[PDB]
Amino acid sequence: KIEEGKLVIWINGDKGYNGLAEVGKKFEKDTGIKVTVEHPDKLEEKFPQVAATGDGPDIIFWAHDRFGGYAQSGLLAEITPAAAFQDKLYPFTWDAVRYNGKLIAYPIAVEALSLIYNKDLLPNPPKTWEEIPALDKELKAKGKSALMFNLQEPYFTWPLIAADGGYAFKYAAGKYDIKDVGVDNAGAKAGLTFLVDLIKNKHMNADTDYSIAEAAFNKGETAMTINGPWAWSNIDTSAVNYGVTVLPTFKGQPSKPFVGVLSAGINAASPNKELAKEFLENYLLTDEGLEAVNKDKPLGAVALKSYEEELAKDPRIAATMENAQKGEIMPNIPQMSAFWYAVRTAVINAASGRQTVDAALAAAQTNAARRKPSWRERENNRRRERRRRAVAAKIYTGLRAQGDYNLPKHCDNNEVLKALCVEAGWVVEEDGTTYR
Amino acid sequence: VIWINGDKGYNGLAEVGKKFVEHPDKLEEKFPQVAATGDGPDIIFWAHDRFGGYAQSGLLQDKLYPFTWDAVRYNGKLIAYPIAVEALSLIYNKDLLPNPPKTWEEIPALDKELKAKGKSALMFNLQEPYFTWPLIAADGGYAFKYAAGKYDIKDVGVDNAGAKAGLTFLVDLIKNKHMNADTDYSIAEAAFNKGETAMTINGPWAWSNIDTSAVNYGVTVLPTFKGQPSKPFVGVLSAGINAASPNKELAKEFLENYLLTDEGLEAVNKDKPLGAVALKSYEEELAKDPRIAATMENAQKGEIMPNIPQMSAFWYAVRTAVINAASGRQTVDAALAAAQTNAARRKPSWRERENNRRRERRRRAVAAKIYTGLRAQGDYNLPKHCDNNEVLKALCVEAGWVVEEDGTTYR
DNA sequence: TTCACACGTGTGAAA
DNA sequence: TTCACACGTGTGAAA
Ligand SMILES: OC[C@H]1O[C@H](O[C@H]2[C@H](O)[C@@H](O)[C@@H](O)O[C@@H]2CO)[C@H](O)[C@@H](O)[C@@H]1O
Ligand SMILES: OC[C@H]1O[C@H](O[C@H]2[C@H](O)[C@@H](O)[C@@H](O)O[C@@H]2CO)[C@H](O)[C@@H](O)[C@@H]1O
């Protein structure tokens, strides 16, 4: 619960929350307002649950794709930056946080996956996914692997699924069509099949998660990983000399990562909107604010023009934005969470052998497009069955009371119904078969 | 490939492996789930208290100390090999607090003194009842009373005057804003390691991260409550072999010949301290560390955790009681009353679930066949589409009943 | 779109 | 122990 006079921030555990706390300390030193930064697990899921009742942090950080669902649920304050401040950030980052014509968060940085490779183990990274199996065969002879990345979050395999034609929601006529899902087309199946076949041919393992891949690459056991700018800090501290380059092609086509804009939304229930707004506009989104976060864990391409023009000189940022250009900014519509849940199930089930590729993507197709009933539709259904049971209960109450049907002391309603049927000239077998 | 909890020295055990490991979430919960399908680990490490429920469900010599073996044995058999003895201790910042408090009762006044300097007195994980149980047991609270050579499931003490007094004091610390109900492991560790809070409660595994920080810390006895010692539940980190593992003795020799060495326990121990290890050879060296001396001084005023299968229901019950009372969702009396009831709660067997599933399937099939027959041969004056309640009404009127709109029925 | 029966488990009865 | 109606949501029909 937000208490007035201080700020509590939620940011994911892979970002530079220690650097962000340093910005919080400067804010506390100038205005007196205490700023606490926390990184709980599954925070993008926890926020919509607690924020609906007015709980949750003052400020929540996540990629922009989750915020439109938050805004639709009335969990976010509208962001009211003056025009002079809006111009300090790239226009496309503001677009990422615009929903129903209103700005619902401050954009922070642009995130895109890249290929990260070990220069010493592999001076020339592969340009295509197709040459990965042969490469791993060649590295397995020296006790190494070619490629390990997180297969528990669909974010990391989506560039491959999208390469030959898979997509989330088709953009048409200025809008995303929530009924036009492309996780089931030929391109998506081609990309996921190539992933599943790397697993079947023992080039990757289906249970590899984030920490396994990160540990493997930074210990020098795999030649390549796929990860974002936040991951560069831990590689720097390791004994691995790495490079950041474009993702491999698949069927001669570029991998298309879904591009995220790390964003900071303000809780609609916060009694500290202006202090939150002041912290974000005049402390975080400054050169010095972003620098403190970025030196903890790299942010990627920051939305603030002044600081990005220094970060853009870094060849790792150049590669990041090269992959970003080949990808697409994620939608922010509320249906994105249902899309992500569906594809997560599909990748894990197909990587696991629990479902075929076609069956997994077929189910993900319908789940991502499924119409979610509103609270009122749910309540209508709940009341209809409550009423149906209520009418039945009164009928059987009356039948038991006045029937004198020659029944055992404690019998179910089916027995009462049977006694009623026989009274009306019917025969009811034990299994329920009924006729006159 | 082996499962160890993410707060232990998994890198230190990985270094043992290379000369010869993953840290999942909720591993203690996942293993009973994935064993029933033959999935899971070769070897699972956890405190001994969970292994009896495992042994009851069938999922699993003198170098090591005698009592460490007793903790990992259930039904006359030995289900894991003990590695280390764990007890919580009070960890304190010497620079902020040269003289740590010896009672819980003086922590409120201390926190008011520290709040004026921008600090707090105490932060520790309030989401896991392991960390609050020492205070709950101080004035008399207990899990299952040991009597007559066994733990009695009919004598549970999470609801007595001592337990209430401990939880009431904890809740009062929160209501007087000396602690926050939502403080978890990560928040408490960060605050202490950054020098923001004067004290924390944690085990030996946490010492490594404090060493990495700039905080001069000491480890000492937990504070008393009502003049009585804090009584932590003492855990023996143990090593069970999966009953379904095809590599049992290849894993067993890894246990005895590579892990439980001094070279290898050392190697894990320098990653994150294990506590008082079960191996005597190496324990004589670590025993001279004053932090280990403090750990076992807390351990002797505590009790060894039971390993009986009810421990899971006990911990779950206690965990929701603490969270519900901390947050204000339940009063202390109501929260512990619910915990007392649920601490021994029976879980229905698979077959019992299946009995219920089949019974209701049969109930619906009998009704469905009655209404199918009525619709087919009734030739009732029903609408084109209507529910079975409408058929039932039409059957009632045929038998000489009248049924009102809402279902009130009479002759 | 609304709607009905299915579905497995919850609450608590009867013993 | 077994048992039965309650319970809200799933599946899929009818429109
Ligand atoms: O995997 C689905 C997941 O993808 C994205 O999450 C990214 C996030 O954008 C990055 O900042 C980083 O934390 O990696 C995450 C994947 O683990 C979406 O932003 C998220 O909504 C979605 O669930
Ligand atoms: O909080 C309930 C929990 O307590 C113990 O868990 C300890 C564990 O023994 C330690 O090794 C360390 O991991 O901290 C844990 C608490 O977060 C019991 O072992 C466990 O069964 C119980 O659920």
* B67/chain A closest Cα distance in angstroms: 36
Task: Give CA separation, B372 vs A246, A419, B337, in Å.
Answer: 64, 17, 49
Tell me which residue of B317, B330, B180, B301 sits closest to B232, measured CA to CA.
B301
Q: How many CA atoms lie within 13 A of A211 on its CB side?
A: 9
Is A394 within 8 Å of B409 when comparing Cβ atoms? Answer: yes
Spatial separation of the C-alpha atoms in residues B44 and B56, rounded to whole Å: 16
Quoted resolution (Å): 2.2
Pair of tokens at residue A154: 């669909």
Residue A416, CA: closest nucleotide via C1'? D4
Rounded to the nearest 5°, which phi and psi values hold at B40? Answer: 120, -155
Candidates 3.40.50.150, 3.40.50.1370, 3.40.190.10, 3.40.1030.10; CATH matching A6-111+260-329: 3.40.190.10
SS3 for chain A is CCCCCEEEEECCCCCCHHHHHHHHHHHHHHHCCEEEEECCCCHHHHHHHHHCCCCCCCEEEEEHHHHHHHHHCCCECCCCCCHHHHCCECHHHHHHCEECCEECCEEEEEECCEEEEECCCCCCCCCECCCHHHHHHHHHCCCCEEECCCCCCHHHCHHHHHHCCCEEEEEECCEEEEEEEECCCHHHHHHHHHHHHHHHCCCCCCCCCHHHHHHHHHCCCEEEEEECHHHHHHHHHCCCCEEEECCCEECCEECCCEEEEEEEEEECCCCCHHHHHHHHHHHHCCHHHHHHHHHHCCCCEECEHHHHHHHCCCHHHHHHHHHHHHCEECCCCCCHHHHHHHHHHHHHHHHHCCCCHHHHHHHHHHHHHCCCCCHHHHHHHHHHHHHHHHHHHHHHHHHHHHCCCCCCCCCCHHHHHHHHHHHCCCEECCCCCEEC
Q: How many CA atoms lie within 13 A of B368 on its CB side?
A: 6
First to last CA, chain B: 73
Q: How many CA atoms lie within 13 A of A82 on its CB side?
A: 5
Instruction: Indicate if CB(B386) is under 7 A from strand C.
Output: yes
Task: Give CA separation, B128 vs A246, A334, B182, B333, in Å.
Answer: 44, 34, 11, 19
What superfamily does domain A114-256+335-369 belong to in CATH? Periplasmic binding protein-like II (3.40.190.10)
Residue A83: partners with Cβ closer than 8 Å, 6 or more residues away: none
Distance from residue B161's CA to the centre of ligand 2 (Å): 25
Q: What angle do CA B99, B104, B105 make, to 5 degrees?
A: 100
Task: Give CA separation, A72 vs A52, A61, A268, A341, A408, in Å.
Answer: 11, 17, 12, 19, 56
Fold (topology level) of B10-86+235-304: D-Maltodextrin-Binding Protein; domain 2 (3.40.190)
Is B403 within 8 Å of A395 when comparing Cβ atoms? Answer: yes
Report the nearest atom of ligand 2 relative to the CA of B316.
Answer: 23
Residue B218: partners with Cβ closer than 8 Å, 6 or more residues away: B91, B92, B94, B100
Residue A116: partners with Cβ closer than 8 Å, 6 or more residues away: A217, A224, A225, A226, A227, A231, A235, A242, A243, A244
Query: A219: buried, middle or exposed (CB in 10 Å: 19+, 13-18, 0-12)?
Result: middle
Instruction: Indicate if CB(A380) is under 7 A from strand C.
Output: yes
Spatial separation of the C-alpha atoms in residues B243 and B54, rounded to whole Å: 10
Q: How many CA atoms lie within 13 A of B399 on its CB side?
A: 26
Is B370 within 8 Å of A420 when comparing Cβ atoms? Answer: no
- Give the method used: X-ray
A 18-57 residues inside an 8 A Cβ radius of B: 38-40
First to last CA, chain A: 66
The reply to whether B10-86+235-304 and B89-231+310-342 are identical in fold is: yes
Pocket of ligand 1 from Cβ distances under 6 Å:
A 12, 14, 44, 63, 65-66, 111, 153-155, 260, 340
Spatial separation of the C-alpha atoms in residues A396 and A412, rounded to whole Å: 10
Residue B351's region, left for phi above 0, alpha for psi from -120 to 50, else beta, is alpha
Distance from residue A181's CA to the centre of ligand 1 (Å): 19
Tell me which residue of A361, A15, A123, A413 sits closest to B388, measured CA to CA.
A413
What superfamily does domain B89-231+310-342 belong to in CATH? Periplasmic binding protein-like II (3.40.190.10)
Residue A370's region, left for phi above 0, alpha for psi from -120 to 50, else beta, is beta
Spatial separation of the C-alpha atoms in residues B71 and B80, rounded to whole Å: 9
Nearest CB to B363; choose among A211, A402, A412 = A412
Residue B112: partners with Cβ closer than 8 Å, 6 or more residues away: none
* A398/chain B closest Cα distance in angstroms: 5
Instruction: Indicate if CB(A386) is under 7 A from strand C.
Output: no
Spatial separation of the C-alpha atoms in residues B271 and B8, rounded to whole Å: 8
Cβ atoms of residues A428 and A434 within 8 Å: yes
Spatial separation of the C-alpha atoms in residues A224 and A117, rounded to whole Å: 4
Spatial separation of the C-alpha atoms in residues B360 and B353, rounded to whole Å: 11
Q: Is A237 on the interface with B (CB under 8 A)?
A: no
Task: Give CA separation, A329 vs A99, A112, B138, in Å.
Answer: 14, 9, 57
Pair of tokens at residue B329: 């969702």
SS3 for chain B is CCECCCCCCHHHHHHHHHHCCECCCCHHHHHHHHHCCCCCCCEEEEEHHHHHHHHHHCCCCCCECHHHHHHCEECCEECCEEEEEECCEEEEECCCCCCCCCECCCHHHHHHHHHCCCCEEECCCCCCHHHHHHHHHHCCCEEEEEECCEEEEEEEECCCHHHHHHHHHHHHHHHCCCCCCCCCHHHHHHHHHCCCEEEEEECHHHHHHHHHCCCCEEEECCCEECCECCCCEEEEEEEEECCCCCCHHHHHHHHHHHHCCHHHHHHHHHHCCCCEECEHHHHHHHCCCHHHHHHHHHHHHCEECCCCCCHHHHHHHHHHHHHHHHCCCCCHHHHHHHHHHHCCCCCCCHHHHHHHHHHHHHHHHHHHHHHHHHHHHCCCCCCCCCCHHHHHHHHHHHCCCEECCCCCEEC
Spatial separation of the C-alpha atoms in residues B59 and B35, rounded to whole Å: 7
Give the residue extent of every domain in chain A. 6-111+260-329, 114-256+335-369, 375-435
Pair of tokens at residue B51: 């292994």
CA nearest ligand 2 atom 7, residue:
B130
Spatial separation of the C-alpha atoms in residues B339 and B315, rounded to whole Å: 9
Instruction: Indicate if CB(A414) is under 7 A from strand C.
Output: no
Helix axes B129-138, B161-175, angle to 10 degrees: 120
Rg (CA), chain B: 28
Instruction: Indicate if CB(B160) is under 7 A from strand C.
Output: no
Distance from residue A155's CA to the centre of ligand 1 (Å): 6
Nearest CA in chain B to A28: B118
Cβ atoms of residues B177 and B188 within 8 Å: no
Buried residues in A351-372 as b, exposed as e (16+ CB within 10 A)? beeebebeebbbbbbebbbeee
Spatial separation of the C-alpha atoms in residues B212 and A433, rounded to whole Å: 76
Ligand nearest to the CA of A259: 1
Contacting residues of A for B411, CB less than 8 Å apart: 402
- Whether B5 lines ligand 2, by a CB cut-off of 6 Å, is yes
Place of tokens 């039904």: B75
Pair of tokens at residue B29: 């919960």
Buried residues in B307-318 as b, exposed as e (16+ CB within 10 A)? bbbbbbbbbebb
Q: Are strands B120-122 and B197-202 parallel, antiparallel or unpaired?
A: parallel
Residue B62: partners with Cβ closer than 8 Å, 6 or more residues away: none
Pair of tokens at residue B95: 């620079």
Buried residues in A303-340 as b, exposed as e (16+ CB within 10 A)? bbeebbeebeeeebbebbbbbbebbebbbbbbbbbbbb
